[PDB]
């Protein structure tokens, strides 16, 4: 689908509210496998199961290993920009 830019607002006591799978070592993108109800990703409205996360706050995740992506994603705070695409 079209590449989308999506804003997410997270408080410091919360996670992103997603589960991710995939990663470079598996030959697939970082993919959203779950959106957890009521948590920041669900609340932001623009992130969905099946979206590939191409970048977060300008950091490209297209060639990142699974655990690299976890570290990068979990470091982001506050107003967080995502670049995503549903394929």
């Amino acid at each position: 689908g079209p590449i989308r830019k999506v804003l997410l607002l997270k408080e410091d006591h919360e996670g992103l509210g997603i589960s991710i799978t995939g990663g470079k070592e598996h030959g697939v993108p970082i993919l959203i496998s779950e959106i957890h109800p009521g948590q920041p990703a669900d609340r932001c409205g623009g992130l969905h199961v099946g979206d590939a996360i191409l970048a977060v706050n300008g950091v490209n995740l297209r060639d990142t290993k699974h655990k690299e992506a976890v570290t990068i994603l979990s470091q982001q705070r506050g107003e967080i920009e995502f670049e995503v695409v549903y394929v």
């Binding site: 996670g15 589960s19 991710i20 799978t21 990663g23 598996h26 496998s33 957890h36 979990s74």
Partner: peptide, 6 residues
Amino acid sequence: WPKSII
């Protein structure tokens, strides 16, 4: 594949 809750 691995799954991480984040």
